[PDB]
Write a protein that binds this DNA or RNA. Sequence first.
RNA 1: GAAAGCGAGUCCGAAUAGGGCGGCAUUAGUACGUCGGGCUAGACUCGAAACCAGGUGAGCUAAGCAUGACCAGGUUGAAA
RNA 2: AACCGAACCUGGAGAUAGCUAGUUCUCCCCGAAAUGUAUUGAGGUACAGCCUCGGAUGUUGACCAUGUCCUGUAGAGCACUCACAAGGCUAAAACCUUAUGAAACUCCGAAGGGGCACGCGUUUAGUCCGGGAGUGAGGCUGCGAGAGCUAACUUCCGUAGCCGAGAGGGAAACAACCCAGACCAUCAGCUAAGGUCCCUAAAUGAUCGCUCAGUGGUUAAGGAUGUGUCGUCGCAUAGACAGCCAGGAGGUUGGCUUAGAAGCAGCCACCCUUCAAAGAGUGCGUAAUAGCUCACUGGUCGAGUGACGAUGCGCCGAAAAUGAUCGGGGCUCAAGUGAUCUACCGAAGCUAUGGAUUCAACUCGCGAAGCGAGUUGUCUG
RNA 3: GCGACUGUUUACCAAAAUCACAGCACUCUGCCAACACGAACAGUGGACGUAUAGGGUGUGACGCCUGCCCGGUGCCGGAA
RNA 4: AUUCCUUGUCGGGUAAGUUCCGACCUGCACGAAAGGCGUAACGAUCUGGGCGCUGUCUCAACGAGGGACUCGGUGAAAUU
RNA 5: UCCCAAAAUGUAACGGAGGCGCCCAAAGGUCACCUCAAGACGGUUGGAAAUCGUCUGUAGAGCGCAAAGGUAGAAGGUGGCUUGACUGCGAGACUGACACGUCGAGCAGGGAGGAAACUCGGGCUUAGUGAACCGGUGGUACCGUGUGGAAGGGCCAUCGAUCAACGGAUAAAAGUUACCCCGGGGAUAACAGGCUGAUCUCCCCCGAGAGUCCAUAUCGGCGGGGAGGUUUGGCACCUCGAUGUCGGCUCGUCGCAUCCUGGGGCUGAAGAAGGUCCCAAGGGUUGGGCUGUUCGCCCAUUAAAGCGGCACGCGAGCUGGGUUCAGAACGUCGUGAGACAGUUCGGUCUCUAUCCGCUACGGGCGCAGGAGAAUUGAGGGGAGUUGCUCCUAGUACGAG
RNA 6: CCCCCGUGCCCAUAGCACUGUGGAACCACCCCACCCCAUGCCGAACUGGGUCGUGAAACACAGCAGCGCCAAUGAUACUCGGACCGCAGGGUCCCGGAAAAGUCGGUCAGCGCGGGGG
Lengths: 136, 113
Amino acid sequence: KRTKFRKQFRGRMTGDAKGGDYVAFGDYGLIAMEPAWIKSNQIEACRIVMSRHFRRGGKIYIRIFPDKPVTKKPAETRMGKGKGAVEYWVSVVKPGRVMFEVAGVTEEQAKEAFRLAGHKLPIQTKMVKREVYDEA
Amino acid sequence: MISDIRKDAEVRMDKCVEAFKTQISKIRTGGGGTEERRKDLTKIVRGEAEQARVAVRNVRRDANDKVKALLKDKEISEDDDRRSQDDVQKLTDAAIKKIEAALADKEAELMQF
RNA sequence: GAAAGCGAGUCCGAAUAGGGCGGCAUUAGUACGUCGGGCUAGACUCGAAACCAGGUGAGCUAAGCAUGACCAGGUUGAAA
RNA sequence: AACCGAACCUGGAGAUAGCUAGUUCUCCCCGAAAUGUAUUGAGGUACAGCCUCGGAUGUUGACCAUGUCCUGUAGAGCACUCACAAGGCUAAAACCUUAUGAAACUCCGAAGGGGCACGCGUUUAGUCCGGGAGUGAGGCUGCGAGAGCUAACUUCCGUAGCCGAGAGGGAAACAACCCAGACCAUCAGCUAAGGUCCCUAAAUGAUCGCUCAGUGGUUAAGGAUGUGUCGUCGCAUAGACAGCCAGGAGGUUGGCUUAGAAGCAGCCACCCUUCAAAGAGUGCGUAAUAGCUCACUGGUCGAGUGACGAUGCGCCGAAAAUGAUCGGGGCUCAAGUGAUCUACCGAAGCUAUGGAUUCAACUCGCGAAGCGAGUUGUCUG
RNA sequence: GCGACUGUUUACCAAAAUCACAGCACUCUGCCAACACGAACAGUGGACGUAUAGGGUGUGACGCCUGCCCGGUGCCGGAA
RNA sequence: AUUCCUUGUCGGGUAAGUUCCGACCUGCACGAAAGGCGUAACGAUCUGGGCGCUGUCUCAACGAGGGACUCGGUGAAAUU
RNA sequence: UCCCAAAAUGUAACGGAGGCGCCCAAAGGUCACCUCAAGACGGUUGGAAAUCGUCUGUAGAGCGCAAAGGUAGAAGGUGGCUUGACUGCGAGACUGACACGUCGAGCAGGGAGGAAACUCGGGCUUAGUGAACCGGUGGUACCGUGUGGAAGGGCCAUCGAUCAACGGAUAAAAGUUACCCCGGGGAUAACAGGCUGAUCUCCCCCGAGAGUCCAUAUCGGCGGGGAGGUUUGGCACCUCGAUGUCGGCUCGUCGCAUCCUGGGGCUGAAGAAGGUCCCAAGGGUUGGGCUGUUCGCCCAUUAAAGCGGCACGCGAGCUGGGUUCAGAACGUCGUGAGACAGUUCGGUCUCUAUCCGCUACGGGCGCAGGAGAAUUGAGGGGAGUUGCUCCUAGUACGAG
RNA sequence: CCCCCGUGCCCAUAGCACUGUGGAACCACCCCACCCCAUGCCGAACUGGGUCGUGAAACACAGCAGCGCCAAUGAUACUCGGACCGCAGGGUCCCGGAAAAGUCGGUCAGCGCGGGGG
């Protein structure tokens, strides 16, 4: 959710995906379609959503931890030194990676699980399945 | 530096509001309203709101001088004077906004019966 | 070369390393003129607010002074 | 003595004026800069950069190749560094498995780029000395980054093109964009962009389909089996889940916890029987049951149906202030659009006949300056 | 509310809570006074005054009043 | 009028008062001879209320006279 | 010093992090020599660390201070001698626009350390810095204004500047102007416009949950997708040889996200009085007190008493209450002059319309004889609000 | 033909690590050490003077693909350049260039001078 110790500011750029993994620690997954800025205020927001639907047996391996600290608009005149790096944190998500994934639940408790938590997503996403092998 | 006064201002402020908001509940004996005996009781409530307004103004006319006479000792330039004002206003106006809102519910009970 | 001064050589320095110049593709040119330009003067032309010097008047309004002028009527009612 | 924070008149100079405005005859040639550095400098100026003139030089320039060297944007990636995803495991750091991020990480790492000698298709600049300059914030646009809601016809670097000082055609109108850089003359021809129903020229041309919104004429999350095309799950002498009538069986017999929660408020778990057949329950309604249905069965109709997954097109989402509109008219008997071809149209581009100007060399004449002549290029606007 | 009062002013945007005042106060000056005008040990104004007189400052009917702080500043005084 | 913070908070007059008069006191930043507080009379002073009257107004209407309009006479301007 | 880049060089931003204005009588010179961090097993006035020892060990440690490069044959850790932490010089290069700046083979003079080849002209390198002028102090006996000295001058050396706004005016310099003046600017602000739209306003998606039961009657966490541009604002592009600024009064008018009416759906809608959402701008939307207000509170009403545009519509229409000229006062800041999105009393805003547009009214010509006069309607404007009451009723309705 | 000793190039397709073969010749241990010379303390190192024994140990050759190390066909990232797309984030088409990693595989070396031995 939040970092422990980092620098001042960072950068921003849209690059290709380096992790063409579909299945990770589970069965189903969640892959985006178009680049978007995932704010840290969304991971925890959808977290409780996938918790109220899962009754005894709901584990999620979130690996989309935000690591792109940005600035925030003042409230008067943006002329002078830098800005305040105290607001929120995002992370570039290139279409081809996984942001959500579970294991144990049934099909009906999966097709709807990832369906509910997706309206707040700037872009559209989809689900995956087996037939995914890369390395040992 | 504003991130330091902001806390000292909100803490002390909310500390009082949260206090009076609980003291007003000690005034309500039970139901409130026994033949004409409704407006006379409101008099006690007026004191709670009156003391509240001042309490919210004190911090404003106390924490301000702590910075105004501080930025004059060659430490902080201008452009911060008005910045500090809009900082205490969001606390003063918000406080009064909660007071009037609270009294609106309390009065609806003291007159309910 | 700072200079003494020495010289088709002279300074750095008691060294033979370089800078300046000579020889080498070698002008040495000078004076008058016209034309580009530079400098100094108004110096492309027009324009200050202001600065200084001398002088103009209080027949302006500000006041002093000398000497004169003026204040219908009615009311009130002090001391003594 | 009618604009007194210092009168008025005359002189000191037409004070200074780094700021403003204006600067007068023609043609031909070249052709800038808004960059860097320093500045009580930041609209100012110096030096260089860039321009021109001329004197020396006279291929060293210029792109294109080849070999040779240096970087370590893009990417990547883990065993370095800072953070980081799940379990192990240990008394948590570490170590392991799986999985990561990164302007300021890097053992990897290209494109392209840069220095060099070398030459050809090339080609015709390059430089040195010296005269005279102006410019010394620059603007947009794609690309590559900072700022900044990766908000501004925002700002600040890099880079290319245009503008700036370049018209002409195109994008209705329009420095920026697209096609192109205008020596002169031609009621002459071929094109580029872009178009070819009518307002202007040029197929209301062809073929295959997509459309039916009048889309084409500022948007999206998200919705609708709207239509076109691709691919996966169960069946017709199982004569199909969906349409029409019937059954839509029981038992068993505790929860936490209520006046109740003994199918459907939340937290468990969810066997059996009779059978052609009946649920480890996808709803509604009640205080719990009743009652309307799901799966499964009989019959007669039953050469077809039901669930999504991908794209081409489109509908909803769509709310503005002087009257409306794609430039307009209109356009589906498409003048909309994906692909296919051809013809034409259409710049001052290329071309034709004539001519003038700038630079070079080649036949000239005269004793010379010089003139005029033909040839190539130019005529950069 | 402001000021006590009558009185004055910003001739051509402000007459007032301005200023002015009567009244109170601190101080200065006895000399050819302090003080001021003056190129001038010239002249004159302070005054043909002379200290409850004269300049300066501030304050301002009248009434109850006029606190604590001289470190710093300035003011007088001291003084090996 | 000094009190930024709302109209601060009760009170007074009003149908209803971000004003005004009494008070409270939290005086952001009262106050003693840049004087405090108070004061009868005076002020073309400022502030609030009441009485009276009223075209200030609800709405104006009508009348008048001076232009304006028409013809003869004289005939300007800023601007451009 | 990195980072920021269009990848050699270079390069902006009040762009992202960090250091210098030294230090070292010797971490310097020369020559010898020493295998670091860190873990692990086992021992000590030790039970975190170190220390001793032994394994491991692409060195993961170190290098005085900043980062980076460099990273072991060592610059890294010790010792002896030593003090070139040198004079006279620089072939040829790096870099700069200029002036600086950096690196350097080889020469000489004389020295230092190894045995020797050799290395040695400060320090692992990059910051630890400053022109020029003016003057201090040692060496040198170039000038020295008649000759001879001397004064003073010149050259070597070196010292002095916290010139720190550091390429650096004087030896030496703070404020204020609402008394303000001149030259200029929309290459720079306030009004307005514009671009924009974070903020504002509002619409839509998801369903946490409230709502007895139930997610959507109503309300909708958390999070999201757009819209409009009336708000704070950002940028500041026409406009500073002048786009008059708030508000009101006057005149209006246009949009819808419709306050009232008008028709509809859903309701958790019996009626009744509502809610809500949909459609729908014809027309309408009061009077006062306070306020300078827009805005808001209150009074008395109403069908209701809408939101916003129009240069926050309207000053060549008015007002001038508000604020941004002068005087004056108060608090407060200022030593002073003076000062304040602090309050306060005062305070001249400009008879004569050209053109467009506009309300009226005429003069011409045309409308194919010249007249009188009666009409069609293309088109165009105006108007269009609403309550109460009674009749059906005290009926459907509902326990009332 | 072999092998040992030095010293080079090469600078992990030569390194570590399991184990072995080797000491006659060479090689190291070991022995001793008043003094040359020498250890912050020790002659472990440095070093002077020198057997046998030994060759677990340092070395030297050799086998084994545990791990290191190198590592290409295809293919994707990026992409000069050429031509476009979406409001934008950002994205594609054509001609070449075109690497990380990971897949196959390949190894624990190869080339000299010199002096000493059968």
